[PDB]
CSV table of C-alpha atoms and ligand atoms in Angstrom, one decimal:
chain,number,residue,atom,x,y,z
Q,1,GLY,CA,33.4,-1.9,-27.3
Q,2,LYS,CA,31.9,1.5,-26.6
Q,3,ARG,CA,31.5,3.2,-23.2
Q,4,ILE,CA,27.8,4.2,-23.0
Q,5,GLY,CA,26.1,5.9,-20.2
Q,6,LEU,CA,22.4,6.1,-19.3
Q,7,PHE,CA,21.1,9.0,-17.2
Q,8,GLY,CA,17.4,8.7,-16.4
Q,9,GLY,CA,15.3,11.5,-15.0
Q,10,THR,CA,11.8,13.1,-15.3
Q,11,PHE,CA,13.6,16.3,-16.3
Q,12,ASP,CA,10.7,18.8,-15.7
Q,13,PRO,CA,12.5,20.7,-16.8
Q,14,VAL,CA,16.1,19.7,-17.6
Q,15,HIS,CA,18.4,22.2,-15.9
Q,16,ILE,CA,22.1,22.8,-15.3
Q,17,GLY,CA,22.3,20.5,-12.2
Q,18,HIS,CA,21.4,17.6,-14.5
Q,19,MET,CA,23.5,18.8,-17.4
Q,20,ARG,CA,26.5,19.6,-15.2
Q,21,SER,CA,26.2,16.1,-13.6
Q,22,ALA,CA,25.9,14.6,-17.0
Q,23,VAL,CA,29.1,16.4,-18.1
Q,24,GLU,CA,31.0,15.1,-15.1
Q,25,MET,CA,29.7,11.5,-15.4
Q,26,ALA,CA,31.0,11.3,-18.9
Q,27,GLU,CA,34.4,12.8,-18.2
Q,28,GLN,CA,34.9,10.5,-15.3
Q,29,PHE,CA,34.0,7.3,-17.3
Q,30,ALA,CA,35.4,8.4,-20.6
Q,31,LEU,CA,32.0,7.6,-22.1
Q,32,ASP,CA,31.8,7.5,-25.8
Q,33,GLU,CA,28.3,8.6,-25.2
Q,34,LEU,CA,26.0,9.7,-22.3
Q,35,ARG,CA,22.3,9.2,-23.0
Q,36,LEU,CA,19.8,11.3,-21.2
Q,37,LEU,CA,16.6,9.1,-20.9
Q,38,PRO,CA,13.5,11.1,-20.0
Q,39,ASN,CA,11.2,8.7,-18.3
Q,40,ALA,CA,7.5,8.2,-19.4
Q,41,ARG,CA,4.8,8.8,-16.8
Q,42,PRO,CA,1.0,8.9,-16.6
Q,43,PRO,CA,-0.4,11.9,-18.3
Q,44,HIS,CA,-1.9,13.0,-15.0
Q,45,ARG,CA,1.6,13.1,-13.4
Q,46,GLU,CA,2.9,15.6,-15.9
Q,47,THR,CA,3.1,19.3,-15.1
Q,48,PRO,CA,-0.1,20.8,-16.4
Q,49,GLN,CA,0.6,22.3,-19.8
Q,50,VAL,CA,4.1,20.6,-20.0
Q,51,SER,CA,3.8,17.3,-22.0
Q,52,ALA,CA,6.1,14.4,-22.3
Q,53,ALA,CA,7.1,15.5,-25.7
Q,54,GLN,CA,8.0,19.0,-24.5
Q,55,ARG,CA,10.1,17.5,-21.7
Q,56,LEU,CA,11.8,15.5,-24.5
Q,57,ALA,CA,12.4,18.6,-26.7
Q,58,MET,CA,14.0,20.5,-23.8
Q,59,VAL,CA,16.3,17.6,-23.3
Q,60,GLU,CA,17.1,17.7,-27.0
Q,61,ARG,CA,17.7,21.5,-26.9
Q,62,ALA,CA,20.0,20.9,-23.9
Q,63,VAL,CA,22.3,18.3,-25.6
Q,64,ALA,CA,22.2,19.8,-29.1
Q,65,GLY,CA,25.7,20.8,-30.1
Q,66,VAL,CA,27.0,18.9,-27.0
Q,67,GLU,CA,29.5,16.3,-28.0
Q,68,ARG,CA,28.8,12.8,-26.6
Q,69,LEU,CA,25.6,13.8,-24.9
Q,70,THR,CA,22.5,12.5,-26.7
Q,71,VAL,CA,19.0,11.7,-25.8
Q,72,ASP,CA,17.2,8.3,-25.8
Q,73,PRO,CA,13.5,8.8,-26.2
Q,74,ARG,CA,12.5,5.1,-26.1
Q,75,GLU,CA,10.5,5.2,-22.8
Q,76,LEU,CA,8.9,8.3,-24.2
Q,77,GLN,CA,7.6,6.4,-27.2
Q,78,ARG,CA,5.8,3.5,-25.6
Q,79,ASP,CA,2.1,2.9,-24.9
Q,80,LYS,CA,2.7,3.8,-21.2
Q,81,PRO,CA,5.6,3.7,-18.8
Q,82,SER,CA,7.8,0.7,-18.4
Q,83,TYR,CA,9.9,-0.9,-15.7
Q,84,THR,CA,13.6,0.0,-15.9
Q,85,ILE,CA,14.7,-3.6,-16.5
Q,86,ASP,CA,12.6,-3.4,-19.7
Q,87,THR,CA,14.3,-0.3,-20.9
Q,88,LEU,CA,17.6,-1.9,-20.1
Q,89,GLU,CA,17.0,-5.0,-22.2
Q,90,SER,CA,15.8,-2.8,-25.0
Q,91,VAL,CA,18.9,-0.6,-24.9
Q,92,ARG,CA,21.1,-3.7,-24.6
Q,93,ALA,CA,19.3,-5.4,-27.5
Q,94,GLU,CA,20.8,-2.7,-29.8
Q,95,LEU,CA,24.3,-2.9,-28.2
Q,96,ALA,CA,27.4,-4.9,-29.0
Q,97,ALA,CA,28.0,-7.5,-26.4
Q,98,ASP,CA,31.4,-6.0,-25.4
Q,99,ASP,CA,30.0,-2.5,-25.2
Q,100,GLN,CA,30.0,-1.4,-21.6
Q,101,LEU,CA,26.7,0.1,-20.3
Q,102,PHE,CA,26.7,2.4,-17.3
Q,103,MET,CA,23.4,3.3,-15.6
Q,104,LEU,CA,23.7,6.4,-13.4
Q,105,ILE,CA,21.4,6.6,-10.4
Q,106,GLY,CA,21.1,8.6,-7.3
Q,107,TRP,CA,21.8,7.3,-3.8
Q,108,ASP,CA,18.2,7.9,-2.7
Q,109,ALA,CA,17.1,6.1,-5.8
Q,110,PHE,CA,19.5,3.2,-5.4
Q,111,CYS,CA,18.2,2.9,-1.9
Q,112,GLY,CA,14.8,1.9,-3.2
Q,113,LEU,CA,16.1,-0.5,-5.9
Q,114,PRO,CA,14.7,-3.7,-4.4
Q,115,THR,CA,11.3,-2.3,-5.2
Q,116,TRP,CA,12.1,-2.0,-8.9
Q,117,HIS,CA,10.5,-4.8,-10.9
Q,118,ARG,CA,12.9,-7.8,-11.3
Q,119,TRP,CA,15.7,-5.8,-9.8
Q,120,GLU,CA,17.9,-8.9,-9.5
Q,121,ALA,CA,18.4,-8.8,-13.3
Q,122,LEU,CA,19.4,-5.1,-13.9
Q,123,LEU,CA,23.2,-5.8,-13.5
Q,124,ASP,CA,22.8,-8.5,-16.2
Q,125,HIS,CA,22.7,-5.7,-18.7
Q,126,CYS,CA,24.7,-2.8,-17.3
Q,127,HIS,CA,27.0,-1.4,-14.6
Q,128,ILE,CA,25.2,0.7,-12.0
Q,129,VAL,CA,27.0,3.9,-10.9
Q,130,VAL,CA,25.5,5.5,-7.8
Q,131,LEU,CA,25.7,9.2,-7.3
Q,132,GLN,CA,26.8,10.0,-3.7
Q,133,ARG,CA,26.4,13.6,-2.5
Q,134,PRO,CA,26.3,15.8,0.6
Q,135,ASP,CA,22.5,15.5,1.0
Q,136,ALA,CA,21.8,11.7,1.0
Q,137,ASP,CA,23.1,10.0,4.1
Q,138,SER,CA,25.0,7.0,2.9
Q,139,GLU,CA,23.1,4.4,5.0
Q,140,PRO,CA,22.2,1.4,2.8
Q,141,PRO,CA,19.1,-0.6,3.7
Q,142,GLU,CA,19.9,-4.1,5.0
Q,143,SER,CA,18.0,-5.4,1.9
Q,144,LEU,CA,21.0,-4.3,-0.2
Q,145,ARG,CA,23.9,-5.7,1.8
Q,146,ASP,CA,24.1,-9.0,0.0
Q,147,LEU,CA,23.9,-7.4,-3.5
Q,148,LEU,CA,26.5,-4.8,-2.7
Q,149,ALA,CA,28.6,-7.6,-1.3
Q,150,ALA,CA,28.5,-9.7,-4.4
Q,151,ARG,CA,28.8,-7.0,-7.0
Q,152,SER,CA,30.2,-3.7,-5.8
Q,153,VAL,CA,33.7,-2.3,-6.7
Q,154,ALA,CA,35.2,0.5,-4.6
Q,155,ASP,CA,37.2,1.8,-7.6
Q,156,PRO,CA,35.0,3.0,-10.6
Q,157,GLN,CA,38.0,2.5,-12.9
Q,158,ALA,CA,37.7,-1.1,-11.9
Q,159,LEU,CA,34.3,-1.6,-13.5
Q,160,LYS,CA,35.0,-4.4,-16.0
Q,161,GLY,CA,33.2,-6.0,-18.9
Q,162,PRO,CA,29.9,-4.8,-20.4
Q,163,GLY,CA,28.1,-5.0,-17.1
Q,164,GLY,CA,27.6,-6.7,-13.7
Q,165,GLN,CA,29.0,-4.4,-11.1
Q,166,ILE,CA,28.1,-1.5,-8.8
Q,167,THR,CA,30.5,1.4,-7.9
Q,168,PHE,CA,29.9,4.7,-6.1
Q,169,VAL,CA,30.7,8.2,-7.3
Q,170,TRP,CA,31.0,11.5,-5.6
Q,171,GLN,CA,29.7,14.8,-7.1
Q,172,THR,CA,28.7,18.2,-5.7
Q,173,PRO,CA,25.6,18.9,-7.8
Q,174,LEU,CA,24.6,22.5,-8.2
Q,175,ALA,CA,21.9,23.7,-5.9
Q,176,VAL,CA,19.5,23.8,-8.7
Q,177,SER,CA,16.1,22.1,-8.5
Q,178,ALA,CA,13.3,21.5,-11.1
Q,179,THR,CA,10.7,22.3,-8.3
Q,180,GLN,CA,12.4,25.6,-7.6
Q,181,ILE,CA,12.5,26.4,-11.3
Q,182,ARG,CA,8.8,25.7,-11.8
Q,183,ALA,CA,7.8,28.0,-8.9
Q,184,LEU,CA,10.0,30.8,-10.2
Q,185,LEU,CA,8.3,30.3,-13.6
Q,186,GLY,CA,4.8,30.2,-12.0
Q,187,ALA,CA,5.8,33.5,-10.2
Q,188,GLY,CA,6.9,35.0,-13.6
Q,189,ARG,CA,10.6,35.2,-12.7
Q,190,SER,CA,13.7,34.6,-14.8
Q,191,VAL,CA,15.3,31.1,-14.6
Q,192,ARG,CA,18.0,32.3,-16.9
Q,193,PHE,CA,21.3,30.7,-16.1
Q,194,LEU,CA,19.5,28.0,-14.0
Q,195,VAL,CA,18.8,26.0,-17.1
Q,196,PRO,CA,20.9,25.6,-20.3
Q,197,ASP,CA,20.4,28.6,-22.6
Q,198,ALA,CA,18.8,26.5,-25.3
Q,199,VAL,CA,16.4,25.2,-22.6
Q,200,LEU,CA,15.8,28.8,-21.5
Q,201,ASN,CA,14.9,29.9,-25.0
Q,202,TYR,CA,12.5,26.9,-25.4
Q,203,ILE,CA,10.7,27.5,-22.1
Q,204,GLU,CA,10.3,31.2,-23.0
Q,205,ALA,CA,9.3,30.7,-26.6
Q,206,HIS,CA,6.7,28.1,-25.7
Q,207,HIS,CA,5.5,29.8,-22.5
Q,208,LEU,CA,5.9,26.6,-20.5
Q,209,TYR,CA,5.4,26.3,-16.7
Q,210,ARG,CA,2.9,29.0,-17.5
P,301,LIG,N1,21.0,19.6,-9.2
P,301,LIG,C1,20.8,18.3,-9.3
P,301,LIG,N2,22.0,17.7,-9.5
P,301,LIG,C2,22.1,16.7,-10.4
P,301,LIG,N3,21.0,15.9,-10.7
P,301,LIG,C3,19.9,16.2,-10.0
P,301,LIG,C4,19.7,17.5,-9.5
P,301,LIG,N4,18.4,17.6,-9.2
P,301,LIG,C5,17.8,16.4,-9.5
P,301,LIG,N5,18.7,15.6,-10.1
P,301,LIG,C6,18.4,14.7,-11.2
P,301,LIG,O1,17.1,15.1,-11.7
P,301,LIG,C7,16.7,14.1,-12.6
P,301,LIG,C8,15.3,14.2,-13.1
P,301,LIG,O2,14.6,15.3,-12.6
P,301,LIG,P1,14.1,15.4,-11.1
P,301,LIG,O3,12.6,15.9,-11.0
P,301,LIG,O4,14.2,14.0,-10.5
P,301,LIG,O5,15.1,16.4,-10.4
P,301,LIG,P2,14.7,17.5,-9.4
P,301,LIG,O6,15.6,18.7,-9.6
P,301,LIG,O7,14.7,17.0,-7.9
P,301,LIG,O8,13.3,18.0,-9.8
P,301,LIG,P3,12.1,18.3,-8.7
P,301,LIG,O9,12.6,19.6,-8.0
P,301,LIG,O10,10.8,18.5,-9.4
P,301,LIG,O11,12.0,17.2,-7.6
P,301,LIG,C9,17.1,12.8,-12.0
P,301,LIG,O12,17.4,11.9,-13.0
P,301,LIG,C10,18.2,13.2,-11.0
P,301,LIG,O13,19.5,12.5,-11.2
């Protein structure tokens, strides 16, 4: 059907590390579309004076004019956060049944997957692609050996069908951090070139991260 990616993050703010990983994810999987999915979180876990809807605008500024990168605001429009599985069915509810869905997660995040609500069902709806990288020691928890055993493919090209498997991918993400960027901004410095230019212009224009 279509090759559709899903890239979830808090994005506070969205920066070139995310965007450059997005770019690479797509090109590797020949995605028709890669969807950035800003997650929703309790109001009190937002950066003070940076709202959900501003996080969402920057993500929009960042993919505007960018082919095949779009934004999915559905978590960002609920009554409160959701579990991922819930996002997944909602996404899938609007898909064609042969469309292939690829959820991109980080190694460290994948390592805590058995704590996600109803985790056993996630691969019902998508493929999970796990970012491997120089900083997260590839030592899977014993709680994930049987899952990786039943559903992982060593070749990403071998992901098949609209979902059901796990593969691993290697990237060297830029040494850009949203935490570093906030501090630079708090310190009054220039994060120019550490974030997409349309994101830079938004941060500046709206005097965000103070
Ligand atoms: N440079 C990086 N390379 C690619 N993706 C990264 C990078 N840093 C974090 N991520 C991604 O960041 C996304 C959401 O923002 P997140 O706050 O988790 O990142 P962060 O840079 O570690 O921010 P923070 O510094 O506040 O922890 C995640 O979905 C994750 O994949």
